[PDB]
């Protein structure tokens, strides 16, 4: 509950909007389907081809938007981290209002595409802000707060969706409740109020920018004040000197015309960047978004509306609760060890499920095992790979490519989200065993990847990497 902790709370407000925006549409989609009358032409008003295609575009728009958001964020952060947060809040305020008043597939598609862009901004900005506003020994611990409120956002959106009539019947013709028509729009409108809270927090209490940013553009004295404020100490010679060395290397870098595109042709920098993009993209091959995006579609085959609803609530609850231990584990045991154990937990989840489905595709025992395996996969991901990745991406790079490569890696993550989710939706309908055996193989490969190539980044100074040492960065 330090000061640096009030500051990360201010940044985690955007992380709450992150999680909320990702899961809000999925929660109340069926209501939109009936109201917008996407399948009013056919007998079934909830299940038709038109709904499937348009829902695919809606999900794709968020992912694509997130890709663009991550790319632009690399350029936007240059003018400030706190500035990025302010822009995010102002942006989400209008986008949420716009989404609240949509009446057609095109306007809501446009709204979600924008909402995705804001998400891509949050993906890079918030973990970077927390990175430069916390103690080096407590970076990881607070870095979990980012993932924590993401998880919390996903949970709150599901909880608010319980105020609904728990869904309209697919074969019925009963019109929605006037309350239900109002409430799903209000759910879209809720992050506008949250955005206002985010703006108020930054402009009233947390006016300062990060000490790293302030020092980088000349504000040395003002950098000292915010540095002394977050550390609660008059003597801040060591972290200031760490920033001074990082910034000086940035100045030498700009002189050598070093950029992300230029560093890629340098084998020393290419190595750490490729490793960063690999680790970032491999988070999606855990299949976590397959569950997040299609929680209803996955269990619609052997579970009814009420149980799917209960399952959704419990899944998001566990996904949120199991994030808390990461605050202690990430720093105490390290990031690499947690990643390795996380991969083991993922393997333990998918491989027995793959074997069970291969033996018998329609066994009752398989259905039950699939439910338990879900929670095993959720607990494993929520405690490790989820939180750690965004913490690691802002600890593994030298200062010259610190922000740019982190943005590139974040972009790859959302690109892989497109690569994993949509084909998985097609595969799991044909043969779940094949999809589950691919995830098992990927879980093993990811284990070996981290085990052999990934180094620990705990307690590292700002702008330092375990891969490239200071003197080695000078010859470049
Ligand atoms: C740019 C600000 C616009 C906000 C205007 C709010 C007016 C009252 C909102 O009630 C609206 O009543 C419509 C009747 O057709 C419904 O269709 C629509 O779903 C519902 O939202
Ligand atoms: C960000 C989303 C942008 C979507 C752009 C889609 C452009 C091509 C489709 O245009 C739409 O053709 C419909 C015919 O079905 C018309 O009914 C509707 O009035 C019109 O808008
Ligand atoms: C890691 C957890 C991933 C799960 C997140 C996706 C959950 C999507 C929300 O589902 C919906 O929940 C509503 C209750 O709010 C139900 O009324 C509705 O029937 C159901 O479709
Ligand atoms: C990658 C997202 C899912 C993570 C792992 C959770 C497995 C839960 C899904 O269970 C599977 O549901 C299929 C529905 O098609 C059934 O056919 C199959 O028998 C059953 O095993
Ligand atoms: O909590 C679930 C979320 O965790 C984040 O770490 C992943 O990047 C998201 O794709 C996932 O949806």
UniProtKB/TrEMBL annotation:
Q: Which GO terms describe its cellular component?
A: plasma membrane
Q: Name one GO molecular function term.
A: hexose transmembrane transporter activity
Every Major facilitator superfamily (MFS) profile domain range: 7-458
Pfam families referenced in this protein's UniProt entry, alphabetically:
Sugar_tr (PF00083)
**Intracellular or extracellular location(s):** Cell membrane
Cysteine-cysteine disulfides: 39-48
What are the UniProt keywords, alphabetically? Membrane, Sugar transport, Transmembrane, Transmembrane helix, Transport
Which reaction does this chain catalyze?
Answer: D-fructose(out) = D-fructose(in); D-glucose(out) = D-glucose(in); D-mannose(out) = D-mannose(in); D-xylose(out) = D-xylose(in)
The record's section on InterPro entries has:
GLUT, MFS_dom, MFS_sugar_transport-like, MFS_trans_sf, Sugar/inositol_transpt, Sugar_transporter_CS
Q: How does it sit in the membrane?
A: Multi-pass membrane protein
**Any transmembrane segments, and where?**
1-20, 57-76, 83-103, 109-130, 142-162, 182-206, 271-292, 307-330, 337-356, 368-393, 405-428, 434-454
Indicate the family of this protein.
Belongs to the major facilitator superfamily. Sugar transporter (TC 2.A.1.1) family.
Q: Which NCBIfam families match?
A: SP
User: Briefly, what is this protein's role?
Assistant: Sodium-independent facilitative hexose transporter. Can transport D-glucose and D-fructose. Can transport D-mannose, D-galactose, D-xylose and D-glucosamine.
Tell me, how does this one assemble?
A: Homodimer.
Q: What is this protein called?
A: Hexose transporter 1
Species name:
Plasmodium falciparum (malaria parasite P. falciparum)
| Gene assigned in the entry | ht1
């Amino acid at each position: 509950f330090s000061t640096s902790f009030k500051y990360v709370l201010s940044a985690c407000i955007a992380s709450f909007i992150f999680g909320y925006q990702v899961s809000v549409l999925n929660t109340i989609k069926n209501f939109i389907v009936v109201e917008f009358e996407w399948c009013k032409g056919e007998k079934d008003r909830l299940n038709c081809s038109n709904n499937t295609i348009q829902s695919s575009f809606l999900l794709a728009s968020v992912f694509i938007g997130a890709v663009l958001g991550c790319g632009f964020s690399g350029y936007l952060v240059q003018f400030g981290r706190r500035l990025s947060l302010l822009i995010i809040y102002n942006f989400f305020f209008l986008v949420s209002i716009l989404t609240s008043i949509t009446h057609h597939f095109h306007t809501i598609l446009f709204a979600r595409l924008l909402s995705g862009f804001g998400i891509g901004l949050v993906t890079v900005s918030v973990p970077m802000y927390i990175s430069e506003m916390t103690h080096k020994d407590k970076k990881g611990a607070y870095g979990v707060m980012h993932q924590l409120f993401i998880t919390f956002g996903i949970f709150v959106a599901v909880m608010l969706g319980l105020a609904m009539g728990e869904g309209p019947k697919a074969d019925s013709t009963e019109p929605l409740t006037s309350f239900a028509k109002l409430w799903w729009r209000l759910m879209f409108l809720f992050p506008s109020v949250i955005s206002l809270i985010g703006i108020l927090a930054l402009v009233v209490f947390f006016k300062e920018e990060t000490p790293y940013f302030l020092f980088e553009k000349g504000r040395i004295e003002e950098s000292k004040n915010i540095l002394k404020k977050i550390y609660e100490t008059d003597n801040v010679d060591e972290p200031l000197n760490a920033i001074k060395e990082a910034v000086e290397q940035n100045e030498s870098a700009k002189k050598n015309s070093l950029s992300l595109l230029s560093a890629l042709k340098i084998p020393s920098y290419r190595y750490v960047i490729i490793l960063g993009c690999l680790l970032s993209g491999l988070q999606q091959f855990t299949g976590i978004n397959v569950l997040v995006s299609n929680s209803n579609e996955l269990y619609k085959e052997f579970l009814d509306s009420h149980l799917i609803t209960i399952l959704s609530v419990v899944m998001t609850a566990v996904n949120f609760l199991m994030t808390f231990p990461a605050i202690y584990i990430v720093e105490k045991l390290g990031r690499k060890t947690l990643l390795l154990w996380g991969c083991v937990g993922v393997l333990v989840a998918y491989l027995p499920t793959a074997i069970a489905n291969e033996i018998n595709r329609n066994s009752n025992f398989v259905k039950i095992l699939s439910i338990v395996a879900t929670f095993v996969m959720i607990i494993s991901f929520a405690v490790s790979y989820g939180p750690v990745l965004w913490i690691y991406l802002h600890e593994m790079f030298p200062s010259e490519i610190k922000d740019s490569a982190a943005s590139l890696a974040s972009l790859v993550n959302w690109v892989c989200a497109i690569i994993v989710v949509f084909p998985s939706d097609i595969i799991i309908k044909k043969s779940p065993s094949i999809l589950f055996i691919v995830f098992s193989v990927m879980s093993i490969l990811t284990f070996f990847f981290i085990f052999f190539f990934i180094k620990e980044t705990k307690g590292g100074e700002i702008g330092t990497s375990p891969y490239i040492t200071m003197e080695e960065r000078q010859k470049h």
